[PDB]
Each structure stands twice: as C-alpha cells, then as structure tokens.
Amino acid sequence: EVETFAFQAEIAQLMSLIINTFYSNKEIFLRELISNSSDALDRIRYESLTDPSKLDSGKELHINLIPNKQDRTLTIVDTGIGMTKADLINNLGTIAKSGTKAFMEALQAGADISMIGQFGVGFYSAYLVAEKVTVITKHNDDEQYAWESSAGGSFTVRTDTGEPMGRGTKVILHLKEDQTEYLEERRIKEIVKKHSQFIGYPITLFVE
Ligand SMILES: Nc1ncnc2c1nc(Sc1cc3c(cc1I)OCO3)n2C[C@H]1CCCN(Cc2cccc(S(=O)(=O)F)c2)C1
C-alpha cells in the first residue's frame, strides 16, 4: 500500500530551483547529508541521557557511505534518531517551509546554493546529483518507512519491507547518468576530507 502526497508548493519550488539552476559545485550535497546524519546522531545521544532505553535499538553511533556501481546508487547510512511517518508526511514540510523562504530571500540578496544548510533544507541539495532519492528510516516507537521522490511535485510513503535497520536513516541517491564520479573512492575521499573532516562520529567509506 503506497500513499502518494503532494509537496507544499514552496518545497516543490525549492526542488525545481535546485534542479534548474546552473551551478557547477554540486559536491556540497555530501557535506549536507553527512551534517544531517551527525545532527541525528547528536539527537539520539542527547535523548539517551535522560532515557537510556532509547539506545535499546542500537548503541553504535556512526555513518556509512556505500557506493554501488551496479545500482548507480550512493547511500548515506546513519544510526541516528530517525524519522516518524508523521515527520515524513507533515512535520518535515512544516518546518522546511520557513527555511525555504529564508534561503530564497538570501539567494536574491546574493547568496549561493552552498549556504543551503544554514536554512535547514540542505537535504534537497541531493537533487543536484540524484534523479531519485529514496529515504529508509526507523524511529523508536514507529515502523520502518520508505519515502521516495523524483521531484515533479509529489513524493510517496510506504511501510518498508526490506532488511530491518534497528534505528536510523538511509538516504539512497539514485545518481543522474553524468554524476557517477560520486561512486569513485578517490572522489568521495576528497570531498569528505575537504568538507566533513571534524564530524564527531566514525564515517566508514565502503569499497565496491
Ligand atoms: N538523517 C536524518 N535523520 C533524522 N532526521 C533527518 C535526517 N535528515 C533529515 S533532512 C530531511 C530528510 C528527508 C526529508 C526532508 C528533510 I528537511 O524528506 C525525506 O527525507 N532529517 C530531518 C530533520 C532535519 C533537521 C530539522 N528537523 C526538523 C524536525 C522535524 C520534525 C520533528 C523534529 S523533532 O522530533 O526533533 F521535534 C524536528 C528535521
């Protein structure tokens, strides 16, 4: 049972801007996703101070980067706090509406796409390099879901039938045909070193 949803017009507008604007420095997507993973790892660590039981779904706090040339995917995996169905359908968009407006205001005033993370919507920078994004996520006290969107104004949510994760989020980037450089070990290493070098969690780059 797959549910189909329309993005708020403001989010659809943001995604179109990311897809349509000529902007050569696409590699910033990876910093934005790693930063989101780090923040989600922080969140579950903090929650666990008052309530140790929230690590019952996994004590290890880390990030994996998994390239796959057969599937033409780059997956960013974390064991952070995860997202609920209510998040995927309602709450993320509610919060992202404000950040999107500020970001577009800043772009008018002369900012560039590389500062998107200051507005809380760096996730959508995935669409610089991906034709489709699939998000697998599991939050304590909710089920594992698959969110998916190829932009175009809509997204889908299903209960995920795949391998159970425990707790956390997988962002699966289905890369555009001309963006397969982000599957190459040397390129990913370069980018993580340049932009994500002080992240306070292990980042494991899987080999093909
Ligand atoms: N890896 C990750 N792990 C966990 N979470 C991640 C994440 N990546 C992202 S970004 C992302 C990923 C997406 C997306 C949109 C975005 I925008 O659509 C499909 O998938 N988020 C979502 C976070 C990013 C920081 C701002 N919050 C606000 C918030 C909302 C609701 C509830 C709370 S609360 O419980 O603390 F009150 C807070 C959401």
Side-chain angles (χ1 to χ4, degrees), residues 2-42 44-58 60-208:
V2 176
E3 291 170 295
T4 302
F5 302 87
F7 285 114
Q8 291 163 291
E10 294 85 359
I11 305 299
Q13 198 172 357
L14 172 65
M15 293 172 79
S16 287
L17 185 165
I18 288 156
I19 289 160
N20 297 333
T21 296
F22 180 75
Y23 182 75
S24 288
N25 184 41
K26 291 179 177 285
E27 70 187 35
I28 55 97
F29 79 89
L30 185 55
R31 168 195 62 200
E32 299 306 327
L33 299 175
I34 291 172
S35 183
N36 290 345
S37 290
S38 180
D39 296 344
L41 289 158
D42 289 345
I44 184 69
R45 186 157 67 100
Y46 302 164
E47 272 191 16
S48 79
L49 287 181
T50 83
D51 183 354
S53 73
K54 290 185 169 173
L55 279 302
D56 287 357
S57 39
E60 196 191 355
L61 302 189
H62 68 141
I63 302 166
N64 297 331
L65 305 180
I66 308 177
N68 188 302
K69 281 198 170 73
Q70 286 291 320
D71 306 342
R72 202 211 282 164
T73 55
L74 181 61
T75 301
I76 301 73
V77 182
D78 71 66
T79 50
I81 187 134
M83 282 170 290
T84 62
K85 194 184 185 177
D87 289 334
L88 294 174
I89 292 175
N90 284 321
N91 300 323
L92 297 170
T94 293
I95 293 164
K97 181 166 171 193
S98 4
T100 293
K101 182 192 176 203
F103 176 54
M104 294 191 72
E105 288 171 344
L107 287 173
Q108 290 294 281
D112 74 298
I113 294 179
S114 87
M115 284 122 91
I116 186 166
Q118 288 180 242
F119 307 90
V121 299
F123 169 78
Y124 298 99
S125 75
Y127 290 93
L128 296 170
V129 302
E131 68 190 356
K132 178 166 78 194
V133 182
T134 311
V135 172
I136 312 302
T137 190
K138 173 71 177 80
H139 192 278
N140 292 335
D141 305 316
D142 203 351
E143 305 289 315
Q144 186 162 312
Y145 300 100
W147 175 111
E148 189 163 79
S149 186
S150 305
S154 71
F155 67 92
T156 65
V157 181
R158 60 178 164 93
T159 301
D160 188 44
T161 54
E163 201 66 51
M165 282 170 33
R167 185 199 62 247
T169 303
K170 303 187 183 179
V171 178
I172 310 172
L173 304 174
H174 304 270
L175 298 174
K176 303 181 196 179
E177 305 162 35
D178 60 344
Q179 303 298 327
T180 64
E181 73 191 72
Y182 302 108
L183 303 174
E184 315 279 18
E185 181 166 42
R186 293 195 306 185
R187 183 71 168 118
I188 299 159
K189 283 181 177 178
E190 175 183 49
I191 292 159
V192 169
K193 181 164 178 164
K194 175 184 182 177
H195 292 305
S196 302
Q197 66 271 75
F198 298 130
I199 296 279
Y201 301 99
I203 295 170
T204 301
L205 176 54
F206 286 32
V207 183
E208 310 220 36

